[PDB]
Amino acid sequence: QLDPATLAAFSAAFRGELIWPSDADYDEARRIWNGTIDRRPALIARCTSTPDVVAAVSFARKSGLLVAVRGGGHSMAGHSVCDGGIVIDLSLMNSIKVSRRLRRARAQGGCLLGAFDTATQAHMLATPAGVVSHTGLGGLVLGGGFGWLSRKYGLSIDNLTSVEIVTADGGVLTASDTENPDLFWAVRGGGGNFGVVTAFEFDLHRVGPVRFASTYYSLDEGPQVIRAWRDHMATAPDELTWALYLRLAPPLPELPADMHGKPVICAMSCWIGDPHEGERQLESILHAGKPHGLTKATLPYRALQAYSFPGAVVPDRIYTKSGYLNELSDEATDTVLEHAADIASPFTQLELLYLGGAVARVPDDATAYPNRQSPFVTNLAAAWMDPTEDARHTAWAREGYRALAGHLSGGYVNFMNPGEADRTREAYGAAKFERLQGVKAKYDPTNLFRLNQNIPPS
Amino acid sequence: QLDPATLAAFSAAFRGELIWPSDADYDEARRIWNGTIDRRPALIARCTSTPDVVAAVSFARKSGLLVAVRGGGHSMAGHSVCDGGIVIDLSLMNSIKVSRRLRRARAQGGCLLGAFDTATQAHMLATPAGVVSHTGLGGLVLGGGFGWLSRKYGLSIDNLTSVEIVTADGGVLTASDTENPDLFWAVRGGGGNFGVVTAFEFDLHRVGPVRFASTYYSLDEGPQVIRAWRDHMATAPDELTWALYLRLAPPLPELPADMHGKPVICAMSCWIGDPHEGERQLESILHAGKPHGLTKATLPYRALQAYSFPGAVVPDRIYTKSGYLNELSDEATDTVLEHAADIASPFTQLELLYLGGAVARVPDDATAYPNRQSPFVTNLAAAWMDPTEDARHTAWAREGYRALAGHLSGGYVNFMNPGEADRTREAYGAAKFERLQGVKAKYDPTNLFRLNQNIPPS
Ligand SMILES: Cc1cc2nc3c(=O)[nH]c(=O)nc-3n(C[C@H](O)[C@H](O)[C@H](O)COP(=O)(O)OP(=O)(O)OC[C@H]3O[C@@H](n4cnc5c(N)ncnc54)[C@H](O)[C@@H]3O)c2cc1C
Numbered sequence A, B: 001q002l003d004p005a006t007l008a009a010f011s012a013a014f015r016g017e018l019i020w021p022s023d024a025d026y027d028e029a030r031r032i033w034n035g036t037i038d039r040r041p042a043l044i045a046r047c048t049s050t051p052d053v054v055a056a057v058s059f060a061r062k063s064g065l066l067v068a069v070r071g072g073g074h075s076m077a078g079h080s081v082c083d084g085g086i087v088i089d090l091s092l093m094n095s096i097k098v099s100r101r102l103r104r105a106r107a108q109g110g111c112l113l114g115a116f117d118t119a120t121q122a123h124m125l126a127t128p129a130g131v132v133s134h135t136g137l138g139g140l141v142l143g144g145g146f147g148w149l150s151r152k153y154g155l156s157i158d159n160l161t162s163v164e165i166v167t168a169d170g171g172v173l174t175a176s177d178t179e180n181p182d183l184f185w186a187v188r189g190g191g192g193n194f195g196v197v198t199a200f201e202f203d204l205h206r207v208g209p210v211r212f213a214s215t216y217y218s219l220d221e222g223p224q225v226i227r228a229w230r231d232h233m234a235t236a237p238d239e240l241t242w243a244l245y246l247r248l249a250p251p252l253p254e255l256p257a258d259m260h261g262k263p264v265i266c267a268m269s270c271w272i273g274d275p276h277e278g279e280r281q282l283e284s285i286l287h288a289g290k291p292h293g294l295t296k297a298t299l300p301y302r303a304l305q306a307y308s309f310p311g312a313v314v315p316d317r318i319y320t321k322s323g324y325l326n327e328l329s330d331e332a333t334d335t336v337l338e339h340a341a342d343i344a345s346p347f348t349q350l351e352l353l354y355l356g357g358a359v360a361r362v363p364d365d366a367t368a369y370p371n372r373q374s375p376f377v378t379n380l381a382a383a384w385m386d387p388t389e390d391a392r393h394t395a396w397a398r399e400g401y402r403a404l405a406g407h408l409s410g411g412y413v414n415f416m417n418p419g420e421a422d423r424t425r426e427a428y429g430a431a432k433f434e435r436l437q438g439v440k441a442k443y444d445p446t447n448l449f450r451l452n453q454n455i456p457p458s
């Protein structure tokens, strides 16, 4: 319960919409993508402008309210909603300005990937981001951001040229390579630790149609397929991206009925470049095993972005355990296949991703993002509907991770689950974590922004 | 040259960006999708809120500035930019609020379709809109709006429940079936004639993955493909949509190279419903000729929306002639094939669309959209790059229209070209036009909003 004068100053300054626990849309406004997170904020402030975010940060600081910031609400740790605090909700700040001649996009901090991609593709332009359209740009970029265009053009942060950011003191700063470069280093991988980003500026690239393929392999052939994949990606051109999703086969017409619901490897691949070269490149990796349900298409980049994932179903409840690998040993390969064979929910995926390429050619210390030199990512992404089955699916992800943990290092902060606060130092490493703390001490000394993979100051 | 106190009142009330002819970004900001339209506004006002729009509409009325209103900039007539007037540019008002429980979306007037579909598809929901993601939602909906979901769920306006609209006098109104219903009737098909819509409210539908097919037929087999189409679509269930696009075959690896750049029928089809039924239904319509470069996929609806058109090239210069047909005779089929054989630009399409279904079940006078009872639309959509070639592409469109004029009636206001201001009466018909003139006399009696398929008051 709040100070009336502080609240009245807030209401007069704030031009967005405020949602209170008694309002009709409070229950839908406080849900985030991870539906296991059920929390009740004192206030949700739907900002519509940078002055709105200023007023909301300042109101929160003066009132002592625990601050959650929300872009697209996809935090796998549930950081975008809080008990008893204020949600600074950016979802209505979804505007993008694209300059075709300059190959530049300026995107507000609340954009969804699909809105961003629609705007840039109006000019046949693009820049790297994640693979599911309704993910928020904000959290994704601040953690690094990888997807289809990343082996060719780097992480999202490798194309970021500046931000507008509201800091804990209510100030509005620009951070770039020429202005507050210490803060600009930190926001490229350091998350929401340093303030609320209200606008991102990106360099764009011309991206025409891309040759794309998706197919399914039986777990029978898993050893030969995963070994073909890790061997080929070690020397693959930047232009090829190839990812493996172990999952239950979806009940789709392109798959034989006897495969529906059983563990398979879903392989998805694309060529960023000439589609005829892409057709030759993909044809040579599609037959590592017998391809079932093969879909080949020459897609506009916006449609590639909208494709993931097959079955198009939004799960209510999720739990993720992830790490990087420097090498994918045969022992790690067998472990991945044994646990994939035990997947229970049709929405769970054991993801095997290969980064590298342009991501790995950026010097390690040039941004806050850790583990550019590890090309493999494995993600035990459990997802289900029924809340009484939480233990089944959570246990699957935990046991898989534990059996792999010796082969893993680091961790992508954007794949951390609600119980992985203690993983922050191991994810960043000692040198980056220490540098991040010094930037935290300068820009957020009270740790007002602590609903994130948190960096304590000093 | 403007009255300096009306100017300063406006700038004080306006919290958005103003672009003047001397500013560096003026030339990029004044371009619209139809690059044959080259106009120089006195002022571009980039609105960020409904009060911004109120200030701009009032400033234009007080100053006598000619008003262009801009959503997504896709006017085939060039109406979203003006010489010497003001552009009320809505492109930054791109926010969408979605209720999963109530299956409702509220979208601002500047949204692009792809941003809208991303936000609704985050909940596996959708509502009918156009087929190209970067089209503006504003002008599309005010004209009617049809696309992949229309045979199943109707026009965009058929799912619209209310608008917030800024009228010529500067007031903000709600318009619905229970509040200002004469205005609500008129904005569902009447264009921007009655004010600036700053928010649309839509009913949503659950749309999971849809089975989709695109393929290409030789003109050799042209007559039997088009007759199969027009025969099948007369009795096809609502769940099937099947459209034909006669064009030069794009140079894509799924097509043999000997077909590249030569006239073909591009056939695109989808089933809105169970994908296994969809696979049977599409296969039953795919083989009236030999299908070259066949792509079949089970796509999330958002990826279907992002798919058009194959080759993903944005043309610089366009010219369109369109009308409705009540029937497609063999004689008209021959004319369409003859004219398609003469297509010169790789970006031109002679489109043959079939609406009907749920569109035709809405009583004719329920909205201002005309010609629900004509199921065929043909669109001679010329598009090219080289400005020295305008005459030839323009001529193709008009010669083709004139050769089909015995079969064509009415006309979609959203497909009309810059020289077609005279066609407004024929498009709506005398009775609808008369009623529209009465709503205009009430809400825009000075015809402040005249850059549209214009309806003069009285
Ligand atoms: C279905 C799905 C697919 C994904 N795919 C990918 C992928 O392909 N690649 C990838 O790299 N990641 C991917 N992710 C992970 C994604 O990067 C993270 O979940 C990210 O945190 C999501 O950001 P958000 O704004 O949507 O989330 P939120 O829950 O809104 O926010 C996440 C964190 O960022 C902070 N934050 C958000 N916006 C801002 C802002 N404007 N300013 C300051 N702080 C902010 C929040 O405080 C919180 O700490 C995926 C996640 C999901 C659920």
Ligand SMILES: Cc1cc2nc3c(=O)[nH]c(=O)nc-3n(C[C@H](O)[C@H](O)[C@H](O)COP(=O)(O)OP(=O)(O)OC[C@H]3O[C@@H](n4cnc5c(N)ncnc54)[C@H](O)[C@@H]3O)c2cc1C
Pocket: B032, B033, B068, B069, B070, B071, B072, B073, B074, B075, B076, B079, B080, B090, B109, B110, B129, B130, B131, B132, B135, B136, B137, B138, B139, B140, B141, B142, B143, B144, B145, B146, B147, B191, B192, B193, B195, B196, B197, B198, B414, B415, B451, B452, B453
């Ligand atoms: C590539 C392409 C694909 C298309 N596909 C389809 C399709 O599948 N189906 C279909 O039905 N049509 C389609 N169209 C046509 C489309 O409906 C019209 O071009 C429409 O006018 C585009 O709206 P806009 O806001 O993008 O255009 P703009 O140029 O911004 O505006 C068009 C008109 O509407 C007015 N206007 C725009 N927004 C508002 C608003 N918020 N309030 C008041 N007036 C407003 C403008 O004053 C102008 O008169 C397509 C067009 C293109 C170029």
